[PDB]
C-alpha cells in the first residue's frame, strides 16, 4: 500500500500574512531580515516571497516581513 | 560665516578620505588646506563625532599607521555634499563658459565638462 500509493492523500495548507500600517511606522514585505544567516534567504525572490516549487521545511521563511521597532535601550 | 566653511570642509574631507585609498599625510595637508598643522587638530575633532550614543562602533574611525590616513568606520558619511544652487556652481559654470582665451581644451574637454556639470546640477 505504501509502495504503490494506494492510501495516499494530498493535503493543502494556506498561510496568509498582511503588512498593515502601525503608529510607529509602516510594515514592509522585503528580503532584508536584519539578523539571520545568508542561506535562509536563498528561496526568496526579489520581492521577498518564496519561489513556486521550492520545498519548505519547519521554520523556513515563507514571506519576509519586518516592522518598525522604535527606540530601545 | 567662518564656521560654515569648516563644516563644509569636514563634510567633504570625510568622503575624500574614504574615496582615496590610503592617502598620505602630505597630500591631505596640501590639498584640503595648506596648513598641515591644523590637519591634526581637525582629525582629532572628527574622531569625536559620530552616531547617536557616541560609543565605539558609532564614531568615525581611522588608521594612523604612518602617513596614510584610512577610514574604517564612516557613520553614514560616504558621499560628498551637493553643489549648492547657483552660488558655487553658478560661479564655476560662468567662469568655465565665459573664458576669453582661444580654445585649447575646447574639442572634447571644455564642452564635455560644461555639459556634464550642467547635467549633474
Amino acid at each position: 500500500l505504501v509502495e504503490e500509493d494506494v492510501l495516499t492523500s494530498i493535503h493543502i495548507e494556506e498561510h496568509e500574512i498582511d503588512a498593515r500600517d502601525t503608529k510607529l511606522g509602516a510594515e514592509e514585505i522585503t528580503r532584508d531580515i536584519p539578523n539571520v544567516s545568508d542561506e535562509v534567504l536563498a528561496d526568496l525572490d526579489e520581492r521577498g516571497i518564496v519561489r513556486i516549487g521550492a520545498e519548505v521545511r519547519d521554520g523556513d521563511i515563507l514571506v519576509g516581513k519586518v516592522t518598525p521597532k522604535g527606540e530601545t535601550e | 560665516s567662518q564656521v560654515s566653511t569648516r563644516l563644509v570642509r569636514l563634510l567633504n574631507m570625510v568622503p575624500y578620505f574614504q574615496a582615496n585609498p590610503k592617502v598620505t599625510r602630505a597630500e591631505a595637508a596640501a590639498a584640503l588646506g595648506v596648513t598641515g598643522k591644523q590637519l591634526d587638530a581637525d582629525l582629532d575633532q572628527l574622531w569625536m563625532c559620530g552616531l547617536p550614543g557616541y560609543s565605539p562602533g558609532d564614531l568615525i574611525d581611522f588608521d594612523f599607521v604612518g602617513d596614510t590616513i584610512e577610514v574604517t568606520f564612516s557613520a553614514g558619511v560616504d558621499h560628498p555634499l551637493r553643489l549648492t544652487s547657483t552660488e558655487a556652481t553658478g560661479i564655476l559654470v560662468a567662469l568655465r563658459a565665459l573664458v576669453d582665451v582661444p580654445g585649447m581644451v575646447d574639442p572634447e574637454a571644455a564642452r564635455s565638462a560644461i555639459a556634464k556639470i550642467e547635467s549633474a546640477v
Binding site: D21, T22, K23, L24, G25, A26, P68, E71 | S1, V3, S4, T5, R6, L7, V8, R9, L10, L11, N12, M13, P15, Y16, A19, A31, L32, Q45, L46, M48, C49, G50, L51, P52, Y54, A75, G76, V77, H79, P80, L81, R82, L83, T84, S85, E87, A88, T89, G90, I91, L92, L95, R96, V99, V105, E108, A109, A110, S112, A113, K116, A120
Partner: protein
C-alpha cells in the same frame, strides 16, 4: 562642547535616521544640546542651527512623524544629499587649473574653493 561638534553630530544623526526625529528627541539624543539652561535657549539655538544648515545647502526637511502620529520632526534626504556619479578626468583637470586665477571678490573665491573641494571629494 563645541558648535562645530554640535553641527556635525546633528548632520550625522539626521542623515542616519529612518523616521522624522522630533526636536524633543534631538535635545536628549544629540550631544551638545543638553547643556542649555532652559527650554527657550535650546529652542532658539536649534532654530538658528536649522537656519544655518538650510542656508548652507544641506537638505533639511520638516514633516510629520508618521500617518498616525501628530508629532512633527526633521530628516535629511540621503538621495537628495548629493549626486555620486562624475564624468571624465581629463576635462576636470582643465576645469580645476582654470578654477581661479585673478578674482579678488571674497564670495567668488570662496565659492570656487568650495566647488573645487566638493569636486575633490567626488574624485580629483
Amino acid at each position: 562642547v563645541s558648535k562645530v561638534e554640535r553641527l556635525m553630530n546633528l548632520v550625522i544623526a539626521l542623515l542616519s535616521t529612518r523616521t522624522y526625529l522630533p526636536a524633543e528627541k534631538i535635545r536628549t539624543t544629540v550631544a551638545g544640546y543638553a547643556d542649555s539652561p532652559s527650554d527657550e535657549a535650546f529652542s532658539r539655538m536649534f532654530e538658528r542651527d536649522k537656519n544655518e544648515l538650510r542656508d548652507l545647502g544641506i537638505p533639511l526637511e520638516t514633516g510629520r512623524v508618521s500617518k498616525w502620529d501628530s508629532t512633527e520632526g526633521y530628516r535629511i534626504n540621503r538621495d537628495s544629499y548629493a549626486l555620486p556619479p562624475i564624468g571624465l578626468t581629463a576635462d576636470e583637470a582643465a576645469a580645476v587649473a582654470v578654477a581661479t586665477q585673478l578674482w579678488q571678490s571674497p564670495e567668488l573665491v570662496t565659492a570656487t574653493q568650495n566647488a573645487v573641494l566638493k569636486l575633490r571629494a567626488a574624485g580629483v
